[PDB]
Amino acid sequence: AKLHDYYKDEVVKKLMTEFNYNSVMQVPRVEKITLNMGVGEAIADKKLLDNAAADLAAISGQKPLITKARKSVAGFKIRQGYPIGCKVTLRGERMWEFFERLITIAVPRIRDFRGLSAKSFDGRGNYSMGVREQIIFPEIDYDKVDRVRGLDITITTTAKSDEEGRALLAAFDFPFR
Amino acid sequence: MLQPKRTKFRKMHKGRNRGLAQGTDVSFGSFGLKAVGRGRLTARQIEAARRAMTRAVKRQGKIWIRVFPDKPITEKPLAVRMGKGKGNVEYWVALIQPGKVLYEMDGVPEELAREAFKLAAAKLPIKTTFVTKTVM
Amino acid sequence: GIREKIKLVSSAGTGHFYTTTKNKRTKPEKLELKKFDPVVRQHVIYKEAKIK
Amino acid sequence: MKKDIHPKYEEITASCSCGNVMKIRSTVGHDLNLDVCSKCHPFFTGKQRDVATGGRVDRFNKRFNI
Amino acid sequence: DKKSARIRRATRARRKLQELGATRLVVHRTPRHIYAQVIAPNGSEVLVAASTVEKAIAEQLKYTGNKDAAAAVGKAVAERALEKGIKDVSFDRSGFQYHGRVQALADAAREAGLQF
Amino acid sequence: AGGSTRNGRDSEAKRLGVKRFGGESVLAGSIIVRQRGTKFHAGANVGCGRDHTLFAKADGKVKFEVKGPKNRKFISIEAE
RNA sequence: CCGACUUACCAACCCGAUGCAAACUGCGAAUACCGGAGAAUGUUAUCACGGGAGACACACGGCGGGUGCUAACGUCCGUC
RNA sequence: UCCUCCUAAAGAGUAACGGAGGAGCACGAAGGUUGGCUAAUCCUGGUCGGACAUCAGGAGGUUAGUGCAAUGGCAUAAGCCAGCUUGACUGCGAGCGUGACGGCGCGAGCAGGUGCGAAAGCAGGUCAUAGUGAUCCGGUGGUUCUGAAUGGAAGGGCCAUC
RNA sequence: UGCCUGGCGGCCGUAGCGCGGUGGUCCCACCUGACCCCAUGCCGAACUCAGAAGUGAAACGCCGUAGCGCCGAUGGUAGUGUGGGGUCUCCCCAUGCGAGAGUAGGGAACUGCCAGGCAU
RNA sequence: GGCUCU
RNA sequence: GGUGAGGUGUCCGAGUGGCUGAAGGAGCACGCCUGGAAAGUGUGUAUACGGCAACGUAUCGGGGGUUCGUAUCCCCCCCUCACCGCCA
Ligand SMILES: [Mg+2]
Ligand SMILES: [Mg+2]
Ligand SMILES: [Mg+2]
Ligand SMILES: [Mg+2]
Ligand SMILES: [Mg+2]
Ligand SMILES: [Mg+2]
Ligand SMILES: [Mg+2]
Ligand SMILES: [Mg+2]
Ligand SMILES: [Mg+2]
Ligand SMILES: [Mg+2]
Ligand SMILES: [Mg+2]
Ligand SMILES: [Mg+2]
Ligand SMILES: [Mg+2]
Ligand SMILES: [Mg+2]
Ligand SMILES: [Mg+2]
Ligand SMILES: [Mg+2]
Ligand SMILES: [Mg+2]
Ligand SMILES: [Mg+2]
Ligand SMILES: [Mg+2]
Ligand SMILES: [Mg+2]
Ligand SMILES: [Mg+2]
Ligand SMILES: [Mg+2]
Ligand SMILES: [Mg+2]
Ligand SMILES: [Mg+2]
Ligand SMILES: [Mg+2]
Ligand SMILES: [Mg+2]
Ligand SMILES: [Mg+2]
Ligand SMILES: [Mg+2]
Ligand SMILES: [Mg+2]
Ligand SMILES: [Zn+2]
């Protein structure tokens, strides 16, 4: 809750100032962080899915929800109901603590990190990025690997616009560019 | 030859052709060829009258065709008895009531439209008349 | 018509039986239901037997 | 949260090469020694230097004199 | 949204009691207060009512939106219903779970003498 | 000689409809409407069958009426 | 690799205007039908039970339609 | 032979070697109940990942879904998830519908015993309408009802069923 | 009695959308926290519990507004029952019924029970 | 073992 | 004219929904033996369009459709094979 305290003391004062909001509830806030791993190769075997949920459970200390196909498509050889991915929703303190370990540890552990994009905010403040490789998290041991995965992070916030989320993450010194 | 591309059904009842029409006023263009009689036209009769007015204007001006043949007409072959199913679809017609504007035209003078619609009406079985765009 | 027919014999000692159908290919395991036995006027477990 | 199903999520200490010390809750268990943190990452100076286009005329005039 | 889904969640048993002709106890639940009212089978007029917004009930309490407040309410509405001669009703949860303050209310009304 | 067909079939008429109209005194259990869906709906003292058949639970006169926000058609038995 | 631009070769969606439908309907009659009340009229004309049948090859004409060519003193239905 | 729509003329019904389509099953959960939920498609952003997997938001508002054809229904969902379960109960059944009849159908309610639910209540198979075959003969289990001098038995009857 | 609000209805778009404005004593809402009751096919998101620091931002409610939606005459037209007629695939006459669409126009709902608050 | 033409 | 069956890469040929944008073989292209050819032998073996070559789209006669999915199911048009196209 270190970053939640930093939000509550300095980010709110900053954004109320730089936007001239009438109310403090008018301020943006982060709501949830969603961690998907779309695993389309688990149709070969469940153990690949079973290991991706084990890896992502080490990243965020939650058991992941194994997602399935909403419908059936033949280009990917799937039927409605096949387990095809895994997700984790992070809220509250576990959200903040992951967001701390992210922007403090893992983003520096990216090979050839040179910034993010500010053009990934889906028109309505919610930011989405995707990592190529799970070893940037230090939870994962490098020898203890099975397969180089990749996942994607989706930060869902209460910002109406795109810039209010851009200012919120910049208030958390989020490495755009 | 006008014809629907798809149809929900292949055949249709014979129906009737009673009542007055709806496409009465000259909507789009300035001059119109209005049906007075009653009956059914075809895609051949429509295309022949289109040719006769396109040639009569020397592709000058703009011609609308308000009708469209959407009714299939079946016929049984020669030396076939009256049973054994409905006949095969042979051609397509448009049911014409009195008052139906068949064609419209603008970009040309009135007298040229008169002689064009007269050349077109000589290909049509029904009795027609010439109309103009009425204000209101 | 692969769904063959069976009978659900009372386990109450009576020779009473309900008759019904099942797919023995997809349900190889025996059917056991708790049904009413009108002789004893109790709900008794019936078990699957052959229709014979 | 549920009781048993989630992994152990415990506060540990992570120290770095820049001498940063940060206590986080993690699934590692043991203490952690890092390599780069957000404090010591060369994102704000080094990546700025790391463009390094260089001039073609300046290489030319550098290689000799008329 | 939440209000509408609570109504959708309630409007089956409400229409069922509407065709049953049942005199019906209606609970309404807030984070701060809890409301109760006994409604005639026409659904258009009430008979008795109780709440934690009333002073005579709220002043005896610590917080209006706990289970102890809900039991005091279900007791009061039962004592008013039996004063007016209403004994058998049917409990409408109004889209809430039969749990917590709602369950403590209905258990208090059962204990005071109502029959459902 | 020649021909054939593929369209010779049709099914039997199920004799649906409204058997007792409005203002028409019925006994309890009397079938009012036979229908596929709930083209009509059951109001007071009127039950809905397995096949959406509307029968009278009591005795009295039939009342057709339109209620609800969806303007659905309800059938009720008035008391008499 | 990025493209460069300018055609008239078209064109999705949307919008506006205009038509068509037995197997379309956000509308909707006249009649017909069911039920109730009320006169007048009518040789109970109504219903139930019982005795005896015959008949189950129809025709044209009007209206509403299928089919056929809105062909047939054609054919198949509804109604008089 | 059976089902659905039109023809069919705004009650029912209504023919043709008239126009179009299906059925001769499936399910021990795809039933019951309690609790909860709400689609299609498109737009943007996003690791492998691509027109189309999974993820987040928005438009939209059922254009989806219904075990299968069509029609009528369906948000209180009849649609979708989970828990507990066997009412896919036995004897009856006022009263109606439909048929020339055989027959077919709907059914509140009563008695017994049961499941879910705190309870009111719901449940006598599935959203409904197709998924079927008379009698005879014969087989199996049960039942003393009968038992050709008497006692049994054979056989027959009745109930269930093939 | 006035105003406001909450709950349950009646009615089922003249009642709905949209746009603009506005509300926080109470109420409501968001909101704080969760070891517990209970819950998440992960997650206190929801459900639930314990509360009351903050805000009316959202939501809701109220007020206004004719961009729509909706309603909607009069007259006429279409059709049609009976009777009659013609040039009879279709129409006409007498008489009775009489639309739909469209037009003028209306129109930013109305109302009941209980409870609470502030005023009176 | 057989194994064409130029 | 009707009925029924059918229509596969260069060829023959198997091919009844999911490893069939294709078995297998032949032929063809390339190589080796040979003075040169053949015949032995060995190796490969779709077309177009699209991207940048990641690799993807289309085509089982052609065209439309069910389906998540069609070379395989259904319709249409053609083409062919077989049978019937009669008694007067
Ligand atoms: Mg019609
Ligand atoms: Mg006969
Ligand atoms: Mg006869
Ligand atoms: Mg006749
Ligand atoms: Mg005859
Ligand atoms: Mg006739
Ligand atoms: Mg005729
Ligand atoms: Mg004739
Ligand atoms: Mg006649
Ligand atoms: Mg009818
Ligand atoms: Mg009729
Ligand atoms: Mg179901
Ligand atoms: Mg429910
Ligand atoms: Mg995408
Ligand atoms: Mg069904
Ligand atoms: Mg015999
Ligand atoms: Mg004897
Ligand atoms: Mg004896
Ligand atoms: Mg507003
Ligand atoms: Mg909360
Ligand atoms: Mg506001
Ligand atoms: Mg009028
Ligand atoms: Mg009108
Ligand atoms: Mg309005
Ligand atoms: Mg308004
Ligand atoms: Mg030689
Ligand atoms: Mg030679
Ligand atoms: Mg294929
Ligand atoms: Mg001869
Ligand atoms: Zn560091």
Side-chain angles (χ1 to χ4, degrees):
Chain A
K2 184 176 181 179
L3 296 180
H4 180 70
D5 187 75
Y6 177 77
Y7 175 74
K8 291 169 71 175
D9 56 355
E10 297 183 356
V11 179
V12 178
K13 185 181 39 164
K14 185 176 179 179
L15 295 169
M16 286 293 291
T17 303
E18 144 187 0
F19 287 100
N20 197 0
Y21 287 152
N22 309 1
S23 177
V24 68
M25 296 302 294
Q26 197 176 58
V27 78
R29 67 182 65 87
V30 299
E31 182 178 0
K32 65 180 180 180
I33 297 172
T34 307
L35 275 72
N36 187 9
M37 277 181 318
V39 172
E41 68 273 14
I43 45 173
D45 183 352
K46 304 292 89 180
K47 293 181 180 180
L48 269 67
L49 173 62
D50 302 322
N51 294 134
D55 290 332
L56 184 142
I59 298 171
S60 64
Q62 294 183 0
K63 185 175 78 70
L65 177 68
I66 295 170
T67 66
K68 294 180 176 66
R70 181 180 64 86
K71 63 185 180 181
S72 180
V73 293
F76 297 112
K77 178 33 180 73
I78 57 171
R79 278 76 167 99
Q80 178 182 0
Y82 289 170
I84 207 67
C86 64
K87 70 180 288 183
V88 162
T89 305
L90 291 175
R91 293 188 179 95
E93 184 181 3
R94 304 295 299 269
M95 176 181 66
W96 293 100
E97 295 176 354
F98 173 74
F99 183 71
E100 182 177 1
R101 294 177 293 169
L102 178 62
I103 64 172
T104 310
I105 298 171
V107 175
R109 289 172 67 94
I110 296 171
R111 181 177 64 245
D112 197 21
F113 174 68
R114 203 175 68 253
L116 271 305
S117 177
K119 292 183 180 179
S120 179
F121 284 96
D122 79 349
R124 292 182 162 282
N126 295 316
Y127 183 75
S128 44
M129 62 178 285
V131 301
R132 304 291 185 183
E133 187 175 301
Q134 73 274 17
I135 310 99
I136 65 167
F137 293 95
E139 305 292 327
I140 282 154
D141 190 79
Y142 181 73
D143 67 45
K144 297 296 182 318
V145 296
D146 303 353
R147 175 71 178 274
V148 173
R149 279 142 165 86
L151 65 153
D152 52 355
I153 307 299
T154 302
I155 296 169
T156 300
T157 185
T158 63
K160 292 181 180 180
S161 158
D162 191 317
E163 189 181 3
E164 296 178 354
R166 182 177 293 112
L168 176 59
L169 295 174
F172 294 99
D173 205 76
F174 196 83
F176 290 153
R177 189 273 324 179
Chain B
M1 290 173 68
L2 292 174
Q3 180 180 359
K5 298 181 180 68
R6 295 177 66 253
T7 179
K8 260 186 288 184
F9 295 105
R10 188 172 180 269
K11 297 174 188 177
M12 191 178 290
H13 292 313
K14 181 166 68 180
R16 298 294 183 270
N17 197 3
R18 59 193 297 268
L20 278 156
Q22 292 296 322
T24 40
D25 293 331
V26 184
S27 296
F28 299 151
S30 177
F31 306 106
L33 182 65
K34 179 178 281 189
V36 170
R38 191 182 298 275
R40 55 181 67 182
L41 301 174
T42 69
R44 293 182 184 273
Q45 295 169 359
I46 293 171
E47 199 271 332
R50 181 193 58 80
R51 292 177 182 173
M53 71 177 77
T54 302
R55 193 178 299 114
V57 299
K58 301 299 295 296
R59 289 81 60 202
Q60 299 302 109
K62 186 172 174 66
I63 295 168
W64 292 264
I65 299 171
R66 296 286 302 276
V67 298
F68 186 79
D70 54 352
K71 184 175 180 73
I73 300 300
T74 64
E75 197 180 353
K76 296 187 80 68
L78 185 59
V80 177
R81 288 176 177 174
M82 281 291 104
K84 285 91 172 152
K86 192 173 175 64
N88 293 270
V89 176
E90 263 189 30
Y91 62 95
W92 293 85
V93 300
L95 291 174
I96 302 300
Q97 294 85 13
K100 172 68 75 174
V101 170
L102 299 176
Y103 297 97
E104 290 183 358
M105 184 181 288
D106 58 355
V108 296
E110 192 274 340
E111 62 270 20
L112 187 63
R114 299 293 289 265
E115 312 271 335
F117 282 154
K118 187 177 180 180
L119 294 181
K123 321 284 172 139
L124 297 176
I126 59 176
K127 185 178 262 275
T128 60
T129 189
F130 186 82
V131 291
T132 60
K133 180 188 287 293
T134 61
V135 175
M136 186 181 290
Chain C
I2 71 166
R3 189 170 177 86
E4 44 182 297
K5 313 188 268 183
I6 57 170
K7 61 189 285 185
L8 293 174
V9 176
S10 55
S11 65
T14 313
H16 185 273
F17 60 93
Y18 285 102
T19 180
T20 186
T21 63
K22 74 184 291 185
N23 202 346
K24 293 182 183 179
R25 296 89 181 263
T26 68
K27 299 291 186 178
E29 54 261 23
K30 298 295 182 181
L31 180 63
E32 292 188 357
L33 297 174
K34 191 180 288 186
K35 304 295 285 292
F36 180 73
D37 193 313
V39 179
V40 193
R41 298 174 67 195
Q42 296 296 319
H43 276 82
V44 183
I45 295 169
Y46 291 9
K47 292 181 182 179
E48 173 179 357
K50 276 175 215 295
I51 190 65
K52 306 289 199 175
Chain D
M1 294 178 70
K2 290 183 183 177
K3 301 296 289 184
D4 293 332
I5 46 147
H6 302 236
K8 288 177 69 68
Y9 186 73
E10 187 179 1
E11 181 174 359
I12 63 168
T13 303
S15 69
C16 183
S17 296
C18 70
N20 205 349
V21 177
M22 307 177 293
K23 293 191 290 184
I24 56 168
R25 291 180 67 192
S26 173
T27 61
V28 172
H30 61 85
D31 194 76
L32 180 59
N33 192 0
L34 295 176
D35 185 332
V36 287
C37 64
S38 66
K39 182 178 180 180
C40 68
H41 186 273
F43 180 68
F44 56 91
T45 55
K47 297 288 105 177
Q48 284 55 56
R49 188 266 308 168
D50 291 8
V51 293
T53 177
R56 191 69 181 175
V57 175
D58 74 38
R59 75 164 262 174
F60 182 106
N61 295 111
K62 187 180 184 294
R63 296 167 75 89
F64 58 66
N65 266 0
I66 294 169
Chain E
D1 195 2
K2 184 184 287 186
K3 176 68 167 127
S4 49
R6 199 191 60 278
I7 301 168
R8 187 187 69 243
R9 199 183 304 120
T11 183
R12 182 171 182 105
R14 286 183 174 176
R15 299 293 296 162
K16 184 67 175 68
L17 271 65
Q18 196 277 305
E19 70 180 2
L20 290 172
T23 304
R24 157 179 72 107
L25 171 60
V26 174
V27 63
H28 186 249
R29 198 271 306 277
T30 62
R32 187 175 292 275
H33 294 282
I34 187 166
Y35 298 154
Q37 311 187 345
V38 172
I39 297 171
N42 56 75
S44 51
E45 66 183 2
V46 306
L47 275 302
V48 296
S51 52
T52 57
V53 79
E54 297 180 357
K55 190 180 291 294
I57 298 170
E59 70 182 1
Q60 300 296 320
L61 297 170
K62 177 180 181 292
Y63 183 68
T64 44
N66 57 2
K67 293 178 249 178
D68 298 335
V73 176
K75 183 179 179 180
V77 70
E79 293 176 353
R80 296 177 187 179
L82 296 175
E83 268 180 1
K84 201 176 288 294
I86 302 302
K87 186 177 181 181
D88 185 358
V89 297
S90 74
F91 185 75
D92 183 7
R93 316 172 284 128
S94 295
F96 298 104
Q97 290 297 111
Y98 187 77
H99 184 120
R101 283 196 278 126
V102 180
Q103 186 177 2
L105 189 145
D107 290 332
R110 294 173 192 269
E111 188 177 3
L114 284 178
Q115 270 174 189
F116 58 64
Chain F
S4 270
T5 22
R6 295 177 185 283
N7 295 321
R9 284 171 313 285
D10 196 356
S11 67
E12 292 178 351
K14 299 297 180 183
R15 293 74 177 163
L16 301 173
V18 184
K19 308 300 180 185
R20 301 294 177 90
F21 290 88
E24 186 171 1
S25 307
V26 298
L27 292 174
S30 297
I31 292 171
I32 299 166
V33 177
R34 292 181 66 245
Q35 57 179 359
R36 284 298 91 92
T38 56
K39 187 184 287 187
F40 294 82
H41 285 275
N45 293 318
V46 170
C48 180
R50 188 186 73 86
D51 55 355
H52 306 119
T53 302
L54 297 179
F55 63 97
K57 284 186 177 179
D59 298 337
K61 295 180 130 179
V62 182
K63 183 68 173 67
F64 289 88
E65 59 190 2
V66 177
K67 289 184 176 181
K70 293 180 181 180
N71 289 45
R72 287 178 176 175
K73 300 179 178 68
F74 288 79
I75 302 174
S76 66
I77 295 298
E78 293 177 353
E80 188 177 3

